[PDB]
Amino acid sequence: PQLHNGLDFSAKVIQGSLDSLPQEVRKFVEGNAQLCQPEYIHICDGSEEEYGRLLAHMQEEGVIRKLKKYDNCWLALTDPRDVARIESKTVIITQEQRDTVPIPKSGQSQLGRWMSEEDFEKAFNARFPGCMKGRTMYVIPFSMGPLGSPLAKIGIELTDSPYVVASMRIMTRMGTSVLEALGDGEFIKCLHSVGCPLPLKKPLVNNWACNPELTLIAHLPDRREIISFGSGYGGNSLLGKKCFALRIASRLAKEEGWLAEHMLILGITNPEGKKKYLAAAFPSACGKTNLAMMNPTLPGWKVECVGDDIAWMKFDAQGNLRAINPENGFFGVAPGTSVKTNPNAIKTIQKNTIFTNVAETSDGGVYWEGIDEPLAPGVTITSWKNKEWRPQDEEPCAHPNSRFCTPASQCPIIDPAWESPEGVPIEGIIFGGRRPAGVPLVYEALSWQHGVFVGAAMRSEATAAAEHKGKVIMHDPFAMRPFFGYNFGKYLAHWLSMAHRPAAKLPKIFHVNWFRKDKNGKFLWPGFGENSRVLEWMFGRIEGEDSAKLTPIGYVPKEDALNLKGLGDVNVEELFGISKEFWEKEVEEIDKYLEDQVNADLPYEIERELRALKQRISQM
């Protein structure tokens, strides 16, 4: 089937067999192999032998170090320029711009960056051709969700970074058994490359191969393809997490009729013997991980974890909104994780965990800001910049966006249904973000329409997750602003459509705010474990208790309704104060944001709620 041996890469397979691969799967491999020209091809099987042999290569290449104080834990230091998820260099490739983002009025579209196919082909042919020269191309077959379960998707990611192969084994279900399940079914085509072929023309920092100048993350929903280049950190290289489970999954969810959201899933049990499942949509670095692994301070309550990031939901035959966690591990922020704040996380990241950009102690341990843990006498600390660090300098020993990669099965409070194929019925949805002043601690929506409005009106201060800096209160609807896969206007309609399904059991909607400060800069709520006091009020409302009070913005707990025993000193007046001067400006910014960003694709019900809220606030 060829004139010269220039298309048959059989003599470059160090593991596996191109013959054992399905038809369309093999064509996808040899196609990019001819374009990227890898030195070798490594078809993954996910076995322990492969994972152990994969670690030795990175260690012998100066990429990762071994943390001797813990059982099979490794540290990795990356290039200082590749530490976050570049939102500015992320594009969605569709034929019509209206499919990706709503055509704005005058202003620019914050709800995504659209790029044409012609402009994408010009940049595509200017990067990949020859990027894997002298490297190994790993074929990674993973599965988002339990194998054989409903709404379970399979993908094939080709990459040249063993740091990606090791992480993909932790975050997804990858191995040979995934190929047997796929057979002749569809699969998302993923392609990743660091962009540093051999010989190296640019010296690498910390042996971290990257190309910041040419970093590009593109999505093609029409082709079911995902193409990333240049980067190699979290959501940029782990295509199954952000690019697949959210952006592309949202497009499929709109076509097929389910939901793909950036929410956590946690079940809570009360002293009376009842258990309910909740979901929370918080922006990055806003409190999703600490909430799903919470150690409550109330006796008789038990909180178990199902997920901390991705959530795929869909109605069932009985009218329930069941959800599953398509992921297999955890990829949460490191700084601030201590025994007092998130004790469940400390128990999980002590074995089979890969750390990144965190400080290392002399005795082989880990260290980061907010760890709140004394060291033994004579122990030194090495910052993430590979330098000797002391608490007297200004350089932090660990990067703000430094992460840990740990399997989900090792969590002590993992819910015994995190891999069930049918999912868990969700009875509540929680919105919120980092709002320093104005937003009360917690309130409840008035209806399903007003609830959707609450999610669309989410705002929060810029944190340390993307490339945003400063204390700016920007908009972030549904905590999905950086992960919208199609038109946001149609997105708001997809949620409002859930109120039309027959025998629909719609869940309640709440808005919280743990970060409301006072006039001095001190948090009015301790948070973390004490957040269970707020979750208790949400549990009773679901059962139908009469503990709510009507306000111009929603339902707030009545007096003597929150279990504040043991505290008593919390300033309740300022923690639930609704100022008329504040909410008259808040709606002003909400009115200007919706008209400029959604424009003609804004549903009438979202506008009817905007007028309803404005009217009620003017009557104060």
Return the closest-CA partner of residue 535 out of 261, 295, 342: 295
Residue 309: CB minimum distance to Mn ion, A: 4
Element (H, E) at 517: none
> Contacts with ligand GDP in 344-383 (CB under 6 A)?
370
Q: Considering beta carbons, is residue 309 or 530 the nearer one to Mn ion?
A: 309
Residue 309: CB minimum distance to ligand GDP, A: 7
The entry of ligand GDP, Mn ion, none that residue 287 binds, CB within 5 to 8 Å by partner kind: ligand GDP
Return the closest-CA partner of residue 311 out of 164, 496, 507: 507
Rounded to 10 degrees, the C-alpha dihedral 411/416/422/428 comes to -80
Residue window 314-353: x/- pattern of binding to Mn ion, with contact defined by CB under 5 A: ------------------x---------------------
The answer to whether 434 is a known ligand-binding residue is: yes
The entry of ligand GDP, Mn ion, none that residue 349 binds, CB within 5 to 8 Å by partner kind: none
CA dihedral sign, ordered 474, 306, 142, 334: positive
Is 343 near ligand GDP (CB under 6 A)? no
The entry of Mn ion, ligand GDP, none that residue 425 binds, CB within 5 to 8 Å by partner kind: none
Return the closest-CA partner of residue 609 out of 465, 449, 369: 449
Residue pair 168/238 in contact by the 8 Å Cβ criterion: yes
Residue window 317-336: x/- pattern of binding to ligand GDP, with contact defined by CB under 6 A: ---------------xx-xx
The answer to whether 11 is a known ligand-binding residue is: no
Q: With contacts defined by CB under 6 A, how many residues of the chain interact with ligand GDP?
A: 20
Return the closest-CA partner of residue 600 out of 449, 489, 481: 489
Q: Considering beta carbons, is residue 187 or 282 the nearer one to ligand GDP?
A: 282
d(CA 547, CA 222): 49
Distance set, CA 23 to CA 17, 185, 491 (Å): 13, 11, 36
The answer to whether 262 is a known ligand-binding residue is: yes
The answer to whether 409 is a known ligand-binding residue is: no
> Contacts with ligand GDP in 252-311 (CB under 6 A)?
282, 284-290
The entry of Mn ion, ligand GDP, none that residue 408 binds, CB within 5 to 8 Å by partner kind: none
Q: Which residue has the tokens 């082989």?
A: 364
Residue pair 366/445 in contact by the 8 Å Cβ criterion: no
Q: Considering beta carbons, is residue 28 or 233 the nearer one to ligand GDP?
A: 233
Residue window 260-289: x/- pattern of binding to Mn ion, with contact defined by CB under 5 A: ------------------------x----x
d(CA 427, CA 416): 18
The answer to whether 287 is a known ligand-binding residue is: yes
Catalytic residue ranges: 286
Helices (H), 522-603: 532-543, 572-575, 580-597
DSSP string covering 453-514:
HHHHT-EEE--SSSS--SS-EEE-GGG-GGG--S-HHHHHHHHHGGGSSTT--PPEEEEE-T
Residues in the chain whose C lies over 2.5 Å from the next residue's N (breaks after): none
Please tell me the total number of residues recorded for the chain in this structure: 620
Stretch of 43-51, 83-91, 483-491, 524-532 contacting ligand GDP, by CB under 6 A = 524-532
* Other Cβ atoms closer than 10 A to 605: 18
Is 531 near ligand GDP (CB under 6 A)? yes
Q: Considering beta carbons, is residue 43 or 260 the nearer one to ligand GDP?
A: 260
Residue pair 279/264 in contact by the 8 Å Cβ criterion: yes
Residue 464: CB minimum distance to Mn ion, A: 13
Stretch of 25-33, 63-71, 313-321, 521-529 contacting ligand GDP, by CB under 6 A = 521-529
d(CA 187, CA 196): 27
Q: Considering beta carbons, is residue 310 or 590 the nearer one to Mn ion?
A: 310
Residue 329: CB minimum distance to ligand GDP, A: 14
The entry of ligand GDP, Mn ion, none that residue 161 binds, CB within 5 to 8 Å by partner kind: none
Residue from 312, 448, 514, 539 that binds ligand GDP (CB under 6 A)?
Answer: 514
The answer to whether 403 is a known ligand-binding residue is: yes
Q: Considering beta carbons, is residue 36 or 492 the nearer one to Mn ion?
A: 492
Which tokens is 103 given?
A: 């055509």
Distance set, CA 233 to CA 42, 82, 396 (Å): 21, 7, 20
The entry of Mn ion, ligand GDP, none that residue 90 binds, CB within 5 to 8 Å by partner kind: none
Is 309 near Mn ion (CB under 5 A)? yes
Residue 590: CB minimum distance to Mn ion, A: 21
The entry of ligand GDP, Mn ion, none that residue 582 binds, CB within 5 to 8 Å by partner kind: none
Residue 288: CB minimum distance to ligand GDP, A: 3
Residue 344: CB minimum distance to ligand GDP, A: 12
β partners of residue 65:
75
Residue pair 219/248 in contact by the 8 Å Cβ criterion: yes
CA angle 332, 336, 341 (to 5 degrees): 95
Q: Considering beta carbons, is residue 452 or 553 the nearer one to Mn ion?
A: 452
Q: Considering beta carbons, is residue 189 or 254 the nearer one to Mn ion?
A: 254
Q: Which residues are annotated as a binding site?
A: 85, 233-235, 242, 262, 284-290, 309, 401-403, 434, 528-531
Q: Which residues bind to ligand GDP, rule: CB under 6 A? A: 282, 284-290, 332-333, 335-336, 341, 370, 514-515, 523, 527-528, 531
Q: Which residues bind to Mn ion, rule: CB under 5 A? A: 284, 289, 308-309, 332
